[PDB]
Structure formats: C-alpha cells, structure tokens
Structure 1
Amino acid sequence: LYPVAIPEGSIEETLTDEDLELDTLIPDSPNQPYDMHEVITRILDDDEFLEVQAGYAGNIVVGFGRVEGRPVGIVANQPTQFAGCLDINASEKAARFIRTCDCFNIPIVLLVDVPGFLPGTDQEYNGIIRRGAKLLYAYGEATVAKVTVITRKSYGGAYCVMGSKDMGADVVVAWPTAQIAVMGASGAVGFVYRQQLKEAAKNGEDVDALRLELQQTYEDTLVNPYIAAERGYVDAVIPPSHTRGYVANALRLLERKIVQMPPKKHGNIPL
C-alpha cells in the first residue's frame, strides 16, 4: 500500500476537472466508439496504468493500477475493437487475469460496455461456449472486492459475464447512458410485437415505419439503466464524474470481506 492524501468532503464536493470530463466522454450516437483508456486513466491514481497483454485480444483491456494507493486490477471492454464484443481470446485473457488477482487478494474493477459475443461460426467451432464460460467461472469464484461500472451497453449473456450483481459483484453503478437489456431493440421488437408487425404487412401498412416506431418505443422505455436499477441489479445510477469517488469509496468499504463457499478440494473450471 502507498500513503496518499484523502480529500475530505462528499463525493459531489470533491470533484475535479479531470473527473468532469467523463460527463461528456460518451458520444451521443450509440454507434460511435470511444476509447476506454480515457475512463481507466481518469479513475486510476496519477493516470498510471500497467497494461497486461496489451497486444492480445484488444477488445478487452486488463491491467494494474492504484486507487488511493490500493493496487487494483482493471478489466474493461474496449469499444474501439470489435465493438467491445466478448470473444474466446478476450474471455481467456480476462479470466486468467482475474484469477491471478484473486489468488493474490487484489480487488477488481470492471468497466462494462459490451453488446454481446462476437458472432461467427468460427467462434462456435472453436468453443466460444466452453472457453467463454472460463471468464464466467473466474469472476464467480473471485472472493476479492469486485466493483462494476457500466458505461453504455450490457446485453444478455455478456451482461451476466461482465460483473452482474447476481454473480457476486459487490457494488454495481451505472452511468446515465447505460443500456441494460436482454437484447438489442431491433431483435426485441422483432420478437415482442410479433404477429403485429406481420398483421401490418398483411394489411399492407408500412411495415418498416411500424418497426422503427416500435423500436423507438422499446429503446425509450426499456433500454436504459432504470429497469435494472428498480430491480436492484444496479446499486446506483451516477453521474460519470462521480465514478472515481464511488470506486474509491466502495473499495474502502470492501477492504475486508468474508464470503462463505462450500468446501472443495478444488474447482472444476472449464479447460
């Protein structure tokens, strides 16, 4: 541990100019990428971040940093590579990084912007299921403090994989731009409101107009932080500028954890 000066005051009161930039980081259009190193550096101490496996599976960034002098392990989705989608290589890289951090009692912070798993027959044939379950297992078994910050997307099984509350995430916070849903609005409206978008075509209405209207309704109502926040899967919806003081406060709260698990000689993680 390193000795650092802790500014006294509320998290609102102790905001900095560097923190305020996170409020404008996220683009307006959901199609537009952004670099997640911006968040990583703005939440870590002295903007220092030792990346691990930088040149491998760029769609996930893993590394070491310090939050108020406490070493932490960052696992973050990278929107600029493959839209941040999880895949076999990212799953294995993040899984082993998490297991190392847990072996040596280093808390982990997960920065989440993930639309799903990278589609493709090669993924299935090479074992996206079996080899992606490794990340799920690693996160599930970690007993260190685990904090999750959701920026933008968290969809489906990718949501379950990337530090969901029910998977043992101690504190989950979401930015106002977070989009937590079962699947994208397009596929959802393709399934709910089914037979209705088909009755429209039978009657000859503008099926495209009806779809787009239904997608708009679905996005407005459900693709947002607040359904999950209501169910309690999100502990707090926060301004982005508040991320650093929420992570620091959460890690300070969780510096000592006791978690009970059944006795085993050892686990059976997929290989």
Structure 2
Amino acid sequence: LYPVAIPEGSIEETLTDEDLELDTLIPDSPNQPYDMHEVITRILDDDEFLEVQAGYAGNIVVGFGRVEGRPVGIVANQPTQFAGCLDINASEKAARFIRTCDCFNIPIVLLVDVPGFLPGTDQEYNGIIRRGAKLLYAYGEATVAKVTVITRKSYGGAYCVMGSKDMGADVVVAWPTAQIAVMGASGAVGFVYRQQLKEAAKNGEDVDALRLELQQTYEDTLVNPYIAAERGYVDAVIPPSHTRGYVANALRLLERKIVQMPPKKHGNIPL
C-alpha cells in the first residue's frame, strides 16, 4: 500500500470535476459505444492503469491500478470491440487474470457493459460453453473483495458471468443507464407476445407497429436497473460521478473477508 490522505466528507461532498465527467459519458443512443478506459482512468488513482494483454481479446480490458493506494485488478467490458460481447478469448483472458489476483489477494473491480455472448458456430465449435465456464469458475472461486459497477448492459448469461450478486459479488452498484434483463427487448417481446403478433398477422394489422409498441413498453418497464434493485441484486443505483467514492469506500469496508468454503484438495476448473 501507498499512503494516501483520504478526503473528509461524504461521497457527494468529495466529488471532483473528473468525477462529474462520468455523468455525461454514456451516450443517449443504446447503440453508441464509448471507450471503457474513460471510466477506468477516472476511478483509478492518478489515472494510472497498467493494462495486461492489451493487444489480445480487446473486447475485455484487464489490468492493475490503485484505489486510495490499494492495488486493485480491473476487469471491464469494452463496448468499442465486438459490442463488448464475451467470447472464448476474452473469457480465458479475464479468467486467468482474476485467478492471479485472487492468488495474491488483490481485490477485483468489474465494470460491466455486456450484451451477451458473441454469436457464432465457430464459438460453439471451439468450445464457448466449456471455455466460457472458466470465467464463471474463476469469479465464483475468488475470495478477495469483489465490486461490480454496471454501466449500461448486463443481459442473460453474461449478467451471471460479469459479477452477479449470487456469484458472490460483495457490492453491486448500477448507473441509471444500466439495463439488466434476461434478453434484449426485441427477443423478449417476440417471445412473450408471439400469440398476439401472430394474431395481428392473421388480422392484417400493422404487426410491425404493434411489435415496436410492445418493445417500447418492455424497454420502458423492464430494461432498467430497478427490477434488480427491487430484488437486491443491485445494492445501490448511483449517479455515475459517485463511482470512485463508492468503490474506494467499499474496498475499505471489504479489506478483511472471511468466506467459508467446503474443504477440497483442489478444484476442478474447466480446461
């Protein structure tokens, strides 16, 4: 640890201008990317980030930084590459980075904007199930402090993988732009209202307009952080500028953890 003088006052009193720049980072359009390094460098001390495997599987960013002098490992989805989907390579990258941090007692901070897994027969044939389960295993096994910040999307199985509460995330916070759902509204509506869309297709109604209206309703009702917050999968929904303060305060709280686990010789991680 480095010595750092902690600023006195609440998280809301200690906001800097660099913190306030997070409030406008997320584009209004759901399909506009942003560079996740803009978040990483603002939550880390001195903007100093040591990226690891920067040239590999750039859809996920991993590396070291300090929060109030404490070394932390970052694992963050990268919207500018493959829309931030998880894939085989990003899974194996993040999985071994997490296991190394956990071996050496380094806390992990996850920054989440993941739409799902990268679709494709090549991913299926090269073993996305088996090799993606490595990241689940690494995160579930890890007993360091685990903090999740959700910025925008956390859908489906990728929600589970990227630091869900029941996978043992110690603290989960979401930005107001977070979108936590089983699947995108287009797919969900095409399923939940299949009977109505086919009935409209019988009647010759404007099935496209109906589908778009149902999708708008589903997005406005469910594709947000608040259902998860209502069930306590998200511990707080916070203004983005609060993120640095929340992370530093949670890491201070979690600096000592005891987790009971069944006795084993060693585990049996997917290989």
The DSSP-based 3-state class of the residue aligned with 2:62 is strand
The DSSP-based 3-state class of the residue aligned with 1:195 is helix
The DSSP-based 3-state class of the residue aligned with 2:194 is coil
Compute the TM-score of the two structures, normalised by the length of structure 2: 1.00
The DSSP-based 3-state class of the residue aligned with 1:29 is coil
Deviation at 1:193, TM superposition (A): 1.2
Q: Distance in 2 between matches of 1:206 and 1:87?
A: 37
Match of residue 31 from structure 2: 31
Q: Distance in 2 between matches of 1:68 and 1:134?
A: 30
Instruction: Write the deviation string for residues 213-240 of structure 1: whole angstroms up to 9, x where unpaired.
Output: 0000000000000000000000000000
Instruction: Write the deviation string for residues 139-192 of structure 1: whole angstroms up to 9, x where unpaired.
Output: 000000000000000000000000000000000000000000000000000000
Within a 5 Å distance, the mapping from 1:38-187 to structure 2 comes to 38-187=38-187
Q: Distance in 2 between matches of 1:193 and 1:117?
A: 24
The DSSP-based 3-state class of the residue aligned with 2:152 is strand
* RMSD, aligned CA: 0.3
Q: Distance in 2 between matches of 1:193 and 1:224?
A: 20
Instruction: Write the deviation string for residues 231-264 of structure 1: whole angstroms up to 9, x where unpaired.
Output: 0000000000000000000000000000000000
Q: Distance in 2 between matches of 1:229 and 1:217?
A: 19
Instruction: Write the deviation string for residues 77-134 of structure 1: whole angstroms up to 9, x where unpaired.
Output: 0000000000000000000000000000000000000000000000000000000000
Q: Distance in 2 between matches of 1:269 and 1:139?
A: 11
The DSSP-based 3-state class of the residue aligned with 1:21 is helix
Contiguous gaps of at least 5 residues in structure 1? none
Q: Distance in 2 between matches of 1:194 and 1:87?
A: 30
Instruction: Write the deviation string for residues 42-84 of structure 1: whole angstroms up to 9, x where unpaired.
Output: 0000000000000000000000000000000000000000000
Q: How many residues align?
A: 271
Q: Distance in 2 between matches of 1:114 and 1:57?
A: 14
Q: Distance in 1 between matches of 2:180 and 2:29?
A: 16
Match of residue 222 from structure 1: 222
State the identity as a percent.
100
Compute the TM-score of the two structures, normalised by the length of structure 1: 1.00
The DSSP-based 3-state class of the residue aligned with 1:51 is strand
The DSSP-based 3-state class of the residue aligned with 1:124 is helix
- Return 193-202 or 89-98, whichever deviates more: 193-202
Q: Distance in 2 between matches of 1:19 and 1:201?
A: 50
Q: Distance in 2 between matches of 1:120 and 1:101?
A: 31
Q: Distance in 1 between matches of 2:59 and 2:39?
A: 15
Deviation at 1:194, TM superposition (A): 1.6
Match of residue 235 from structure 2: 235
The DSSP-based 3-state class of the residue aligned with 1:188 is helix
